[PDB]
Amino acid sequence: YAMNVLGNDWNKAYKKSARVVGDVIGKYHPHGDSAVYDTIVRMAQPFSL
DNA sequence: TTTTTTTTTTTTTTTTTTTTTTTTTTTTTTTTTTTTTTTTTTTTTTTTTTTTTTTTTTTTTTTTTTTTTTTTTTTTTTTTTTTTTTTTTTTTTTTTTTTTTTTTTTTTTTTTTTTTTT
């Protein structure tokens, strides 16, 4: 939801992971960074999903 | 106004314990030295027809010493018991998976101050 609200569309240019993690932690997820980034890393990598 | 009782932290330095620097013994690790395997070719060894004079088996008969034989008494064999080892259920502990809670370190760059050595 944070990546959709930011506008991280698949055909648009990339955005840094720090901005997305900061936006998620600031707005939606109250559980602090370094665990949202692990979920993002797992969702990105092709041998896990 | 002078004088009298009591209380504790310090002059403490010494005894006990703890912490921190040390170096003998069995378990790793790199080296040299000896067991394995594949090619060349090479004189050398070795596979297969022909002839040949040989020397051991099969007609026949003989005996004697190993094959018959019965029996006493041993002694290896088997029985029970118990110990030692092997092997497998049982239990315990530890590790990895993915979202969470927490933290912790090493260096550049300059300029100024402490803090030891000569």
Is the distance between the Cβ of A34 and the closest atom of strand B smaller than 7 Å?
A: yes
CA distance A34 to A11: 27
Is the distance between the Cβ of A7 and the closest atom of strand B smaller than 7 Å?
A: no
For residue A36, which of A14, A15, A20 has the smallest C-alpha distance? A20
Distances (CA, A) of A41 to A18, A21: 12, 11
CA distance A44 to A41: 5
CB A27 within 8 A of CB A2: yes
The residues, ordered by sequence, that sit 6+ positions from A36 with a Cβ below 8 Å of its Cβ are A21, A24, A25, A29
Angle of CA points A48, A4, A46, to nearest 5°: 15
CA distance A13 to A31: 28
> Mind spelling out the 3-state secondary structure of chain A?
CHHHHHCCCCCCCCCCHHHHHHHHHHHCCCCCCCCHHHHHHHHHCCCCC
Resolution in Å, one decimal, please: 3.0
